[PDB]
Structures are given as C-alpha cells and as structure tokens.
Amino acid sequence: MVTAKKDENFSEWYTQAIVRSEMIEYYDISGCYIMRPWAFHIWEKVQRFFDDEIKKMGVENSYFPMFVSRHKLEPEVAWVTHYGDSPLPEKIAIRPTSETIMYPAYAKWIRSHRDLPLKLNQWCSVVRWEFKQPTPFLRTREFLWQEGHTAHATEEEAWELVLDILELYRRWYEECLAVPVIKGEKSEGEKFAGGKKTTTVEAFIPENGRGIQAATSHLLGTNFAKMFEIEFEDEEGHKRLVHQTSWGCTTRSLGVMIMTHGDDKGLVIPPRVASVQVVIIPILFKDENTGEILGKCRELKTMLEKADIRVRIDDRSNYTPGWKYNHWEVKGVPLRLELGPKDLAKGTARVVRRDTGEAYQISWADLAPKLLELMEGIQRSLFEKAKARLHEGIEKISTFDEVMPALNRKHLVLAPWCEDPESEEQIKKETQKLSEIQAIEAGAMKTLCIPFDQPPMPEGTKCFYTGKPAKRWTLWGRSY
Amino acid sequence: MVTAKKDENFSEWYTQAIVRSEMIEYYDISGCYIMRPWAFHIWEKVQRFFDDEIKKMGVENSYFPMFVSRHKLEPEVAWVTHYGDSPLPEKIAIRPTSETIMYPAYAKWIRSHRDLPLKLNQWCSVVRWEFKQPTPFLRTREFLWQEGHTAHATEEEAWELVLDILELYRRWYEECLAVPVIKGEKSEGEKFAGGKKTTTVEAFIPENGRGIQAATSHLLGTNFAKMFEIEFEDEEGHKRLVHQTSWGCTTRSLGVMIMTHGDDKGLVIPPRVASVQVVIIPILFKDENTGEILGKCRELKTMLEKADIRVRIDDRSNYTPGWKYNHWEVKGVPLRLELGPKDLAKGTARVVRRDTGEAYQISWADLAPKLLELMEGIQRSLFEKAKARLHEGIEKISTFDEVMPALNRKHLVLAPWCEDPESEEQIKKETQKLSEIQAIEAGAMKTLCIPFDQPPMPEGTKCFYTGKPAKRWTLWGRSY
Ligand SMILES: Cc1cc(N2CC[C@@](CO)(C3CC3)C2=O)cc(C(=O)NCc2cc(F)cc(-c3cnn(C)c3)c2)n1
Ligand SMILES: Cc1cc(N2CC[C@@](CO)(C3CC3)C2=O)cc(C(=O)NCc2cc(F)cc(-c3cnn(C)c3)c2)n1
Numbered sequence A, B: 001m002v003t004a005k006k007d008e009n010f011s012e013w014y015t016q017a018i019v020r021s022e023m024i025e026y027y028d029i030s031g032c033y034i035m036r037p038w039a040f041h042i043w044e045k046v047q048r049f050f051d052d053e054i055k056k057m058g059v060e061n062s063y064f065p066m067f068v069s070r071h072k073l074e075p076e077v078a079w080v081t082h083y084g085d086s087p088l089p090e091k092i093a094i095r096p097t098s099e100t101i102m103y104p105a106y107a108k109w110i111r112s113h114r115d116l117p118l119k120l121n122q123w124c125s126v127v128r129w130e131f132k133q134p135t136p137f138l139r140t141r142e143f144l145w146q147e148g149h150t151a152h153a154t155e156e157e158a159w160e161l162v163l164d165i166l167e168l169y170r171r172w173y174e175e176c177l178a179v180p181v182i183k184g185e186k187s188e189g190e191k192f193a194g195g196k197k198t199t200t201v202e203a204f205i206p207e208n209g210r211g212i213q214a215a216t217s218h219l220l221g222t223n224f225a226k227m228f229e230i231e232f233e234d235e236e237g238h239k240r241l242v243h244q245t246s247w248g249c250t251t252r253s254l255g256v257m258i259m260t261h262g263d264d265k266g267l268v269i270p271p272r273v274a275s276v277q278v279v280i281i282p283i284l285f286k287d288e289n290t291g292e293i294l295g296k297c298r299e300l301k302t303m304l305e306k307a308d309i310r311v312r313i314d315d316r317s318n319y320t321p322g323w324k325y326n327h328w329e330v331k332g333v334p335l336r337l338e339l340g341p342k343d344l345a346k347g348t349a350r351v352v353r354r355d356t357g358e359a360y361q362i363s364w365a366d367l368a369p370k371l372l373e374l375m376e377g378i379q380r381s382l383f384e385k386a387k388a389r390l391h392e393g394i395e396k397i398s399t400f401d402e403v404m405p406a407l408n409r410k411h412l413v414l415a416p417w418c419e420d421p422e423s424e425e426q427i428k429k430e431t432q433k434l435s436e437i438q439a440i441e442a443g444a445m446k447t448l449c450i451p452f453d454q455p456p457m458p459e460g461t462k463c464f465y466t467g468k469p470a471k472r473w474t475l476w477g478r479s480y
C-alpha cells in the first residue's frame, strides 16, 4: 500500500511507488540502483521497439569497450588505477559516452565514399560520477542507454538522420510510454560539447514544475571528424571530412513515465509496455467449485493470449481478492479481470481499468476484442490527459516581469528571445537569486529548448529580457 | 583474402579470419576488442535463443550495478579510486561476477517459502584483468556474458535447475553453433570458489590440442546463503538456508565456433546463426538486360524471405562476381546464389554451399524448400564433422606412460582416476616439466572434466597415476 499523496510530498510518493511495486532496490554505492524485473521488462519492451526501428534504417548493433585511455579522452569521469595491489602503468577511464572510443575505429574504417553511410549503435551502460544527490531513473551515476553514432558524406544526410532519430525518440515517449514531449533545438550555451547542433525532446514534471531532457540527437557535423581525422575519398580522389551524428536515450525514460501516469494508489503503466496487461483474479469461496473457476480462468488466459494480450493469473489462495486488487494496482497493471461463480453462471467477467477505476461486464465471446479496445482506450487517455497537463504547464509571456509569478506556479515559460548566450547566463543567475530570496520568506531558470513548433512571431516583437529584436520563441524553466 | 593455412599457423589464421571478415577491431587498451556488427549479429542470435529458453523456465532479466564495494567483495579485479582529480573515500571494484552484488539484495527479498524459487538473470559485461596475453573472444579482459542466479527451497530443486541450464548450454553450442561439447563435472581442485559442485560443457580445439571451458553451471548450495544470510521461513516458522545456483556463458562461444568451422578461405558460419544465410550475386554483363536480372533477384529475395530465409543482394557494379565470391566466403555466408541471363532464360539459379563448395541448379519454384533442406544439410554436416574431430581427439588410456605421447599428438586423455586432489597437482607439475624438456629438443595438463558419459569401468581398474582404485573416468588435457 502507498500512503504518500502525489500532490503533497512528491519525493516520498515517487520513492514509495518505485519501491513498493518492486521496480527499484537500493544499493550501497550512492547513485546506483538495482533495476528489478518489474521495471526491466518495460526497458526491454522500449528497447525492442527502438532496436526494430533503427534496424529498418540500416543501423547495426556493435559493442565497444567500456575503457578509454587517458590519451584519447584528452570531470565526472571515474578512473581505474589499480588491478588489485598492482598499479596501472597509465590510468584508464570508464566511458561516460563513447565518441572518443569509437571514432578512432571510424577513422580506420572509412576510406571511400562507398563506405558511407556508416551507422552503428550499442546498448550498454555508462558512468557519470557526480557528487550531487541522485534520483532513481532520472539522475544516476550509472545508467543503461543506447548510443548511436553515424557518419555521412554530406551535412544534409546527417541532419535528416538526426531528425529521423528525434522522431523515433518522440515515438518512444509518446507512442510507447504515453508521455508527451516537445521537439526542440538546444541553445548554443546548452548544446553538446564539440557538436554543431543539438536537438532534443523535452518532458515536463508538473508536481515540481521541472522540465527534463528526455532524449538527445546531436548533429556533430565535421567537428569530431577533424579531431579524429575521419575522411572519405570521393570518386574524384579528394579527401573530405565525414558529417556525423550521435544520439542517446536512457532508463530516465522509465522515471518520466512513472511520474507522468502514477496516482495515489501507485504505478499506472501504459498497456503498450506493461509486461502484464491483464491480471485475472479468481474469486475463491470455500463453498464453491474452485477447480471449475480456475479452469475457466486458464481458458480465458489462452483465449486472450491468442489475441497477443499479456495475461497473468493470480490464483493464490492465501491472499484475499482485496489484497490482490491493491497488490496489482500498486504495480500498475492496466486491467484487472475478476471471475467468480456468479460471473461463470452468467458467462461474463468483470473488468476494472486501472486509470479511472471504471468497471465493465463483458461476455467471454467479446472479451478479446473489448479488452483490446479498452487498452487503446487507456493508452490514448493516459496520453491526452498528460498532454493537457503539459499545455496547462506552459505560460506564453512577453516580459521578464512575468517570469517569477510563472515559476512560483511551477510552470514553464514560452518567451520571445534574441538567443544571445550572455543573456541566458544573466537570466539564470538573476532567477536563482530571486528564487533564494523567495525561499527566505517561506533554483535557477534556464533554457530547455527552442521548439520546432514556433507560434506566430508578430513583426516587431522584442526580446523578453534584453529588449532587442526577438529571434524565436524559447521554452525556459527550472530543470532537472 | 585469407593467406595463412589453418593447419600450419593457427594463431595468424584465426587473427586473419576474424579481422578480414570485419568481426573484430583492435583497441588501445590491451585485452579489449571492438565487437563489430558481423560478430555482434551472431551474439544477438544466440542471446535471443538463450533468453527465450530461460524465460520459459521463469527466469527474469534484471540489471545490477557494475560497481561493488570493497567491503562486500571481501586478485584480477580493477579498482576505481578517483573521479577525476578527486579521490574516492573508499575505492570501488568493477564486477568480475555478481554474486557479491546480487546476494545482499537476495537476503532482503527472500523471507517466506512463497518467495522461492527466485530466478534472475542479467546480460552485461564483466572485467577480469589478467596481465597475460589475450586471445580474441576466448580470453579477454572485458567480455559480454549472461549470468543467472537462482535460489530455491531445497538442494534437489537447485540441482535440477543446474542440469537444465547445462542442457541449455549444450543446445547453445551444439544446436545453434554446431559445436559439439562434453557435459562434465569439474574436480574439486578446479571448481568455483565457494560453490558445492560445478558442472561444465567442454569444447576442444584440434589445431592446438586444447580443451576450453565453453560454459559453466554451478550448484552453490547453501554456501553463499550462509555468507549473506539468505533464509526463508517454512510454513512451520523455522528459518532455513536457500540453495542457490549461478551459471554463465560469454562471447567465448563465438571464438569457439570460428575455430571449429573455419577453413583456409576463412569463416564458415552455421546457417542457424548467420545474419546472411543466402547472398544473391547477380551477374552483370554490360551487354545484358541488367534491370531484368536485378528485378528477378529482388523477387527471389522476397520469395525466400517469406520462408524466413535471411537474404542479402550484392548488386554492386564496381566489383566483379569473383571478388564478391571471395568477399562473402571470407565472411562465411553459408549459401551463395548466382543468377545471370542463362539462368534467367532457363528459370533456374546456381547455388554454392560454403562448407564443401558443392554447386546445384535449382528451379525458382523449388528454391525455398531446397535451400531450407540445404541449410539444415550444412548445419548437420558442420556438427558431425566437428563431432568426428572431437572423438578422434580423445585417447582412452590406462597408464601415465600413455600421457605424453597422447599430448604430443595434440589429443586429450580419458583416464581412470581416483579423484585425489594432490594427484591432480602432481600430474600438472610433472606434465609441465616433461613438456618443457620436450620443447628444449624442438604446457601443463590438467583435468577438464569428469564426464557425465562414463564408459564401462571394469571391476578392479586402478588409477592411471596413483595405482589406487580408480573412481571414475576423467578427461584431462592441455587447456585454455
Ligand atoms: C539517468 C541519467 C540520464 C542522463 N541523461 C543526460 C543525457 C541524456 C539526456 O537526453 C541522454 C544521453 C542522451 C540523459 O538521459 C544523465 C544522468 C546523469 O547526469 N547522471 C549523473 C548524476 C548522478 C547523480 F547522482 C546526480 C546528478 C545530478 C545532477 N544535478 N543534480 C542536482 C544531481 C547527476 N543520468
Ligand atoms: C572471454 C572470457 C571468458 C572466460 N570464461 C571464464 C568463465 C567462463 C567459463 O565457462 C564463463 C563464465 C562462465 C568463461 O567463458 C574467461 C575469460 C578470462 O579469463 N579473461 C581474463 C583474461 C584476460 C587475458 F588477457 C588473458 C587471460 C589468460 C589466462 N590464461 N592465459 C594464458 C591468458 C585471461 N575471458
């Protein structure tokens, strides 16, 4: 049972939700968490989705070492210096990302324009060792991810690949996880180190008012090619720099799903990625033909599974049906199917959907088509409600005077911005001091993205902080 | 093109085979190798096979951290001591295996007999940092693996699980990879540290005469439960120690496949795990209807792929068909399909199988069923020939006098042994000195396994080294 209200103590609510559903187990070494089967199944499902999608683009999986030499990497990096009692001749680092691991190989592999495009991906874990306090799924020192790295003959090929991947990330969140995101370009002050242009999908956490960078797709261009001398020969003979992309996404996505859909009873997992879509709970009166009831549950299980519905029967006699109702609600199973002697006599079943609590009586013959329609019903609704909370979380503003009241309501701001970097740094330090002063009477706002969706820009619109001619609409807010 | 003979310089043959087929790329940090897509596809296929199989047993996937504290682990272990310029308050280790990472969690999770069996697995990489020289796939400082860990209420449940997993490993090698193995029990001198009984599947490398431990399945029993206080309550109330298993298998299996099936032209990959089973090579005379020929290749591709045959068309005009013949032979594609204007006019195709070089002419209508029959033909033959080379590699002996002549022929020995540990150590040190002395005129033999398949033991048979009553037949040899 979950006891903390989501709209009061969000921290303890999230901890309770992920622990009591058997998603996360704690670990000795600060910032690392055991991912238990209940959460790993979801990671497996989104990984299968993304893998299939990128294999249709020609991306292939590989595995590069987790170690990188001090030479090639040359802040939040863990160093190996000993193999037991013996010292290393030169300390080695654990990958925080693998550009400097993979790209010397790329320089060796790419000779001719007939070698491009080169498209590799890997599923692994990386280690970014910050001493700040962690957050399960969202900010951990070790995390699982995929990272893809492509090299191309032209800039425009690489850019189209960046956008195609960003679309796949939008589908990862919105399609599988029912989390709405915003496609954007990062400012030059927040873009990847060494890249040309970083795109992103941003998500939003209403309860603390914080945007979070859900995934990233970088146009590296020729910057890394220069660093690593990755060149191809054209049909003429002339050597030219390849144009590269890199893109990544992590188990952070799981956290974002949890916070988006959970409620006071606990997890609410979208049907598309639930490892159990329907849990069948037989009623088990002592004064009843139990073998018959269980036989019919088994029949309904096979009947649903032929429609590819993922079913678990909880026939444990040492727990009441109310205990099981709570137990599978806490783990977020989207549909519960109850079947007792009355239901049997009438040839129906009772189904309760996890999102709203609504109950239905369905005849066995209509069970598979009806539940299918209901699962798409739940998924869709989970998305649209979340989409509502997204749009109600963003205030469109004209002046800096409107920032602080919008932040105190846990909202983001969409403002006309001139895109000057020094202005962003100024804005962060000022909103941070204003936040501290407000805290005294009871931090910093940054750019999250310049959205692809640009609303109308009136002709003479001025920058909301500098007064200069505004260039584009920018989404700012407090951030993870 | 591969130029080193497999039966002359096996080292350079193996290196050439794995490099020239684009399986392995070298890396700065000694003992680590980049696994390129051509090899990773095979790893993906065997991983899918094993994953499916263990999910039918109820095993679930998880992910535990790659770090372990100095406390809990308390030789070939890499230590992290710094996060950049800052020192760690207590150095941490990178997993060489995860018993000491997972089992405190197990102690927390297992309370009641209704919590057993507990069956977890993970796919990750581990780091065993030896300063000896590495061997691609076979012996590397970092390797990918799966490791499974189960806890049970009784010893016999855990033992049946150990044997079931060992059977799945036999199917991993023999069924998918067409490599024959021998099921055995390891001596107490070679068994896992802290376990009760280690089982294994052993493979054999004829060209250097060396057995290699292909995979391992340990009965831990209650030893680790005592160390970590993992206890369950029975229905009576009494706390009891759980009985545990752990089992693992790695990318070593890939190496063993390569060495088993490759020839002087290079790789020979069994059809069951080839990512390309049929490469279709159109003949492309300049004086021919090329669009027609390519159209028919595309048709044959879709026709074969509806029978679930994995097909690639190599329609590159800048390479001759002979270049492509060599190129896909080197990468080990099991079937090659050639199609030109003559074949088109006759409605047939030419197919050449990679193992023997045999050619066939098949009408399009029979293409899918015939190729299917041929792929099982290749697989089967790859296995049986390898099985032959296995059995011809083992000499059954009675006396120690027969050891050295059997080792000088690169063979293993099956000998009646009393199973005394001090005898094994004696045997290793003596065969090593005899080997060194022989080398002067131009090392050590150990036990590989006590096979499950015990041949007849005559009543008064004496130990082949000590003269004592022999206990069981034991397979010895030089080893990886
Ligand atoms: C799971 C995950 C995902 C991502 N990221 C980043 C990249 C991206 C975004 O798209 C994806 C690759 C493309 C993603 O998912 C970044 C981290 C992370 O920075 N970890 C280190 C850490 C540990 C820690 F204990 C605390 C803090 C910390 C930071 N501020 N505070 C107040 C605490 C940070 N972790
Ligand atoms: C790929 C892989 C698999 C396995 N093993 C062991 C376990 C098992 C067997 O079933 C599987 C888990 C169950 C498996 O596959 C063990 C190693 C390995 O010991 N690596 C370290 C290393 C690095 C190095 F550069 C050199 C040497 C070395 C040792 N002697 N010499 C002359 C050189 C050793 N590596």
Ligand code: PRO
Pocket: A097, A098, A099, A146, A147, A148, A192, A216, A218, A246, A247, A248, A249
């Ligand atoms: O960390 C990053 O942002 C990029 C994308 C994945 C690989 N490196």
Ligand code: PRO
Pocket: B097, B098, B099, B146, B147, B148, B192, B216, B218, B246, B247, B248, B249
């Ligand atoms: O390394 C070993 O041998 C065991 C089996 C995999 C996990 N630990």
